[PDB]
Every structure is written in C-alpha cells, then in structure tokens.
Design a protein around this ligand. Structure first.
Ligand SMILES: O=C(c1c(O)cc(O)cc1O)n1cccc1
Length: 217
C-alpha cells in the first residue's frame, strides 16, 4: 500500500563526540568558514583511498573513473552540498566512523581548545567532519561504497543520529554531505563566498573542484 517503506535506526553518539558537537554547534567562533576546507579535505582523503585501490585493481572504478569534488549551493532549500566520488562508506563505516566510536582525537581536540588552540586545527585531530555544525543545524550524509547499497546518515546533534537505506537518487560511488544551514549562515550559499574560501584554503587539493549553482525552476 505505501509508496515505500524502510527501516530507520537511531544511534546514540559516543559521549565525547556528543560533547564535541555541542561545543561546536553552540559556541561562537569568528572563522566558521573553515568547515568547507575540512569537508573538502575529507573528500580528498576518500578520493585518495579509492585511487589507491584502483592502482592494483582497476575494476574498483567500474562504479566511476572520474575522481572529483562538487560543491552545490541551493538557496531555495538553504543547503550547501559537498559531493565526492571517493571510496564511500559501508553501513558499518557510517555507524563506526560517524558517531559510535570516539577516536582519541575527539577528547584531545577539546583539550587543545581548552589549552588555547584554535578551532581551525580540528582536522589535525581527525574530527574535522563535525566542523559542519559551525554552519549547519542539520547534516545529512548520503554514501555509496563499492558492492554495498546507498545509505543516508543524519543528525541535528542533540545526542543521536539516524541511518537508513537511501534510494532517492543512486550515486555511482562516493559521499554527499548535505549541510542544512543555520539561518544566519546563508553567506555560504553565495558564489563569491564559496569561490573565495576555496581559493584561500583548498588550493593544494589535487582533484577538480566544481561549483554547481542549483535553482529549482
Ligand atoms: O566517505 C568518506 C567521507 C567523505 O567522502 C567526505 C566526508 O566529509 C567524510 C567522509 O567520511 N570517507 C571514506 C573514507 C574516508 C573518508
């Protein structure tokens, strides 16, 4: 009877990750634009990984040979999406790496901030993904790994995230990070702003970065 039905799982964040998310999403920082550098860096790392695998097994790229990063502002939805064609994540990867297991870098980073370090150093602690919450009230991650199905991870912080199968628009391979922006952070939907941030912070990224300005007609 229903058009579609699917199981949704809700997981609690590991305590230290929940603490980090609360700090990031609530605290004032003057340099919030670093979120985009961090997400592009993550995409680059994911692209390095599938590239590495393809060196010995070319069929790893049967799901797509092009290795690149797309930035997609949608003013109508107030979303900024970062898409890459990297190695992607399995369901276990999402649950393990995006919330339930805290690397030592989670607590370490919060200690560093207490000791006077800057938020911009977050990537050195391996938790730069969570800088998304500097500008986003909700983050949705759509991901597809070879031989696995496509999943959607989502959290508005507040202590938990959800995982479910995603069947909306099939990706060949990779990860989309959809930032649902806070009301006062819509500057990051402007072409001028995105370009200047990429030029300043991501000049050494070794993959094509392409802007797609999205407008529903
Ligand atoms: O899918 C990703 C991925 C991504 O491509 C973008 C991000 O912002 C966060 C991520 O975890 N990875 C897979 C292996 C290493 C990273």
């Amino acid at each position: 009877q229903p058009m579609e039905e699917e199981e949704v799982e809700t997981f609690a964040f590991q305590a230290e990750i929940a603490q980090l998310m609360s700090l990031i999403i609530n605290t004032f920082y003057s340099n919030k634009e670093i979120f985009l550098r961090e997400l592009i860096s993550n995409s680059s790392d994911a692209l390095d990984k599938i590239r590495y695998e393809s060196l010995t097994d070319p069929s790893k790229l049967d799901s797509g040979k092009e290795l690149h990063i797309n930035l997609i502002p949608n003013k109508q939805d107030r979303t900024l999406t970062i898409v890459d064609t990297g190695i992607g994540m399995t369901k276990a990867d999402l649950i393990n790496n995006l919330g339930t297991i805290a690397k030592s870098g989670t607590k370490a980073f919060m200690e560093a901030l207490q000791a006077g370090a800057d938020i911009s150093m977050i990537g050195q602690f391996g938790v730069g993904f969570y800088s998304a919450y500097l500008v986003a009230e909700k983050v949705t991650v759509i991901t597809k790994h070879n031989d696995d199905e496509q999943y959607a991870w989502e959290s508005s912080a507040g202590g938990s995230f959800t995982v479910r199968t995603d069947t909306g628009e099939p990706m060949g391979r990779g990860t989309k990070v959809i930032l649902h922006l806070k009301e006062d952070q819509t500057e990051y939907l402007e072409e001028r702003r995105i370009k200047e941030i990429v030029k300043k912070h991501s000049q050494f990224i070794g993959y094509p970065i392409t802007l797609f300005v999205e407008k529903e007609l």
